[PDB]
């Protein structure tokens, strides 16, 4: 009767399991981040960059402890176990949601700032020696925390206490909930998804990628100890960014679900699903708070994974059949990619190396992997002129009508570069004889363009063959 509607109906097993995960993440997170904060505080580094990096890691540790010590216990009591009434008053309702929002901005901005300091260390060392200072980095970290508090102000006005009992008078129906319309709530949830998640993680990913490549080039073409440390920092920060994106995506999907699904679609089934989804997505938020100190400890492991992946790329290109076998057996990432977006399979198909292609596919290589322009291994094989690789690829389930950013299909590339044999085999496997690129060019048009009169003929024949169908 009085507060029946506010009942959540998650089974007791769920609550106990989630409580176990929450308490496990509480101790792992508090010990990990506590030890980090303590150590870094008592630490004095000769090298400016080491000091500056540690200031950022100290910020990340502080934000994590605030969520684990203050947010987690409140969440466990009032959102996992006792859904109504809210125990902690109006200020507690606003303070809880303010703290959580502000901590996401602080984490995101600390990660982006870290990725900028590393980028400059690697790509502008001489300017970085002068333009950077310990005391200026401290001032900037203060500005980050103030900016994070300012961006979280909307939660003070969007969240509050409401009595959702039948007639709004029963004390059991007193809940911490949004106190603004859906239109207003949509705006604030989108602000957080963009400015704490999508935008900052996209910028940290770009800076981290460019820094990693530039380090490889500046090494390939110095201080051994600096390169070793920078390579660890880049790879740790990459694991931090990936960990952040995986852990926060469900949370942002859940909040968008809350404002985008219409009343009519809110069945009890969907209501029931939501409160289970809440358990999973809030668990992953506490994983986010606990994982960074563990990632710092796996720095040498991350360098090894990276060394293996990069060795498989050279093995697959250079034509070292044996090297590829060994590296795969170890556990080297078969679907790793270089600066262009080429996987080992891309590099194998490009250079010939029928064997290495067969070995890679067998281990479970993505046959339809796209480089940054949308070229599949089948594109590369058609372009260079290797029939056996095309047959092997098609066999393993390669898309015959896969198109790049310009709308170039494999049949376009076979016809353009005078590969009659390949034109034949692609047609046989269901290649559209009149596929057009952005500019209306068919395989036939490209055959004639490059004075390939024999291949224009077979394509004419392929075209008239379609016409007889009707």
């Amino acid at each position: 009767g009085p507060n029946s509607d506010l009942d959540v109906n998650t089974d007791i097993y769920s609550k106990v399991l989630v409580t176990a995960i929450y308490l496990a993440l509480f101790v792992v997170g508090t010990v990990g981040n506590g030890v980090t904060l303590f150590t870094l505080a008592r630490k004095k580094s000769l090298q400016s960059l080491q000091s500056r990096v540690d200031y950022y890691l100290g910020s990340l540790a502080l934000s994590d402890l605030l969520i684990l010590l203050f947010a987690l216990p409140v969440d466990l009591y009032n959102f996992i176990w006792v859904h109504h009434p809210w125990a902690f008053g109006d200020a507690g309702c606003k303070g809880y949601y303010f703290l959580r929002e502000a901590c996401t901005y602080a984490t995101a901005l600390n990660v982006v700032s870290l990725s900028v300091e590393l980028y400059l260390a690697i790509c502008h060392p001489f300017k970085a020696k002068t333009l950077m200072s310990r005391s200026r980095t401290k001032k900037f970290i203060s500005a980050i925390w103030l900016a994070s508090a300012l961006l979280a102000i909307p939660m003070l006005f969007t969240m509050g206490l409401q009595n959702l009992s039948g007639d709004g008078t029963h004390p059991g129906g007193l809940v911490c909930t949004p106190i603004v319309d859906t239109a207003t709530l949509r705006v604030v949830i989108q602000l957080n998804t963009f400015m704490s998640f999508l935008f900052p993680m996209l910028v940290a990913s770009i800076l981290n990628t460019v820094a990693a490549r530039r380090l490889t080039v500046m090494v390939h073409q110095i201080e051994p100890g600096r390169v070793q440390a920078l390579r660890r920092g880049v790879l740790v920060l990459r694991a931090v960014v990936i960990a952040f994106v995986v852990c926060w995506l469900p949370y942002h999907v859940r909040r968008l679900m809350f404002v985008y699904i219409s009343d009519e679609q809110w069945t009890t089934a969907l209501f029931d699903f939501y409160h289970y989804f809440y358990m999973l997505s809030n668990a992953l938020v506490y994983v986010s708070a606990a994982i960074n100190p563990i990632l710092y400890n796996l720095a040498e492991d991350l360098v090894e994974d990276w060394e293996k992946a990069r060795k498989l790329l050279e093995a697959a290109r250079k034509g070292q059949d044996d090297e590829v076998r060994i590296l795969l057996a170890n556990g080297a990432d078969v679907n790793t990619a270089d600066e262009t977006g080429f996987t080992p399979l891309h590099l194998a198909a490009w250079e010939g190396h029928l064997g290495i292609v067969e070995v890679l596919l067998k281990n479970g290589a993505d046959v339809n992997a796209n480089d940054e322009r949308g070229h599949t291994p089948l594109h590369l094989a058609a372009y260079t002129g290797h029939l056996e690789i095309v047959e092997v690829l098609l066999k393993n389930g390669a898309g015959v009508n896969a198109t790049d950013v310009i709308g170039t299909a494999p049949l376009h590339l076979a016809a353009m570069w005078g590969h009659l044999e390949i034109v034949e085999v692609l047609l046989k496997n269901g290649a559209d004889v009149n596929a057009q690129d952005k500019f209306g060019k068919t395989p036939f048009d490209l055959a004639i363009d490059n004075g390939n009169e024999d291949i224009a003929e077979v394509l004419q024949k392929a075209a008239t063959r379609e016409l007889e169908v009707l």
Binding site: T177, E264, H275
Partner: peptide
């Protein structure tokens, strides 16, 4: 339906 969640 119509039973929206109250917990964000």
């Amino acid at each position: 339906g119509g039973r929206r969640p109250y917990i964000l």
